[PDB]
Subunit: 285 residues, 2 copies
């Protein structure tokens, strides 16, 4: 007997970092980008060596089940770097309960994914987890709620993994340390997110693309982008992408690019891997 | 013309600090404990000198309304120290919109109170604001949600203000810096909150009181209580309180004590002010 669990991932269109301060964020489920965790028997009991979201999901699950001596090991595993912190949490929790064949209502799961994220010190706005449990793009505000969005632009979004494992915590630190000097950054993002909705409302991928490139500049100035991400966006843009920006926690992670044609989309991903992206993925919009 | 806004407050029964890591928290509306803010005309435009939740509520309101030159001043004002960070935010926002006679749906308000709290760097779990907008006690978990609780113990809760202005941010820092050593603290609180629900379910004020005293010890050990708070609880207990603990952000703030008789309640508050509490208040349960 082996326990297995699997979660889908997501990608942030816009609102990264700003969501942390109560500003809206729009994100898209990545239903075909999944993560899997297996749980197996072990000689010695399971221990806690780190504050990473996986170990933390195990712990939070064990605490719940009330098991201190869990003689088990929980490894991971696709599309590697495209699985988020929450995605990993969800998968583990499921794998753990499944191993123990424990009952798991959706409320509980959601409660435990967010708790693991929190004790992993990821400082969740609640957006990652939320989107990984949704099957529709959503509009989100921390500590308040979300609404599902209609998303039909007949466009494609190309996702590229920078290869650099995102230092999300450090990124939140940067924006946090800026204090009041982040307000203009936050403000600018708040606006861009508003227009982003309009554009989406009007099914104007071009308008949208523009807004995204902008979002990237502000994310870059505030200091949470990366050279890998920046050069990938540049490549994106220098190949006719309606727009491009980094998505997620920053300081590593992924890039997203907007396009309205399939030939173009496949071309862009190729071009990107060619430039050094470890993986790519094309999502319909 | 003068703008005015008014919010009610709340008190945390249990889950302080632990709620920050995704653990449940139970809190009670304080409908008769209100805060008021007035907004008036001014010579020079309004500026931002600090990251305190009031100024932050003004800013977030102005940003929303899209007013940069707000030639206005927004002062505060009762039951002083019993008004929370969110309570102050709510009152200001209302006073500001009211001054401008701007439309304000409840969604917007709630969105702006939480945003102000966030830019004021208060690190809201969402509980303060939530309870200040509720008229029923609630069970709460960060980034997930809340449920209203039935609360009928025919008991009284005595609230005492330590006088020391709570250093809530610093307190969150302490628990944050403990890292993994806070897990046992969090765990213990998670449990206590569970029993707290049971007791409430069974209308067992004694059982409940016990749990509260315990909650105070763990809050004290982890290092977020205060001498003023501790000595007040001690006085509470040394006078037959079913239980007592600090409530709120810690490092200052208030104490709550449980009792089931009115004579006892009034007696306790007196005794407490006598010991140095700046204000007291008795809420029905
Ligand atoms: C900074 C944030 O606003 C965005 C984080 O984006 P992701 O959750 O996609 O990042 P990782 O899971 O670390 O790869 C934090 C937050 O809102 O949770
Ligand atoms: C530490 C916390 O869990 C409890 C804060 O309690 P209050 O919001 O009542 O404190 P103040 O408004 O500063 O007086 C933080 C949180 O959950 O928001
Ligand atoms: Mg994340
Ligand atoms: Mg507060």
């Amino acid at each position: 007997k082996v326990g297995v669990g699997q979660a889908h991932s997501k990608i942030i269109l816009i609102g990264e970092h700003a969501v942390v301060y109560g500003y809206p964020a729009i994100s898209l489920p990545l239903l075909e980008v999944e993560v899997t965790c297996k749980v197996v028997p072990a000689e010695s009991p399971w221990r806690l060596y780190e504050e990473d979201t996986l170990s933390m999901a195990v712990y939070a699950s064990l605490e719940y089940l009330n098991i201190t001596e869990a003689c088990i090991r929980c490894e991971i595993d696709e599309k590697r770097g495209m699985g988020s912190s929450a995605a990993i949490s969800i998968a583990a929790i499921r794998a753990v309960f499944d191993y123990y064949q424990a009952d798991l209502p959706h409320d509980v799961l959601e409660i435990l994914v967010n708790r693991a994220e929190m004790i992993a010190h990821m400082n969740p706005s609640g957006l990652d987890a939320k989107t990984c449990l949704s099957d529709q793009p959503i509009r989100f505000i921390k500590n308040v709620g979300f609404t599902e969005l209609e998303m039909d632009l007949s466009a494609y979004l190309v996702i590229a993994d920078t290869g650099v494992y995102g230092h999300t915590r450090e990124a939140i630190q940067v924006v946090q340390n800026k204090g009041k000097d982040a307000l203009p950054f936050l403000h600018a993002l708040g606006e861009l997110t508003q227009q982003a909705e309009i554009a989406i409302s009007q099914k104007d991928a071009e308008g949208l693309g523009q807004i995204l490139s902008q979002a990237h500049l502000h994310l870059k100035e505030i200091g949470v982008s990366s050279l890998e991400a920046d050069s990938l966006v540049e490549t994106a843009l220098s190949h006719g992408a309606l727009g491009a920006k980094m998505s997620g926690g920053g300081l590593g992670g992924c890039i997203i690019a907007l396009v309205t044609n399939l030939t173009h989309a496949q071309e862009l991903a190729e071009r990107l891997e060619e430039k050094g992206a470890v993986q790519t993925w094309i999502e319909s919009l």
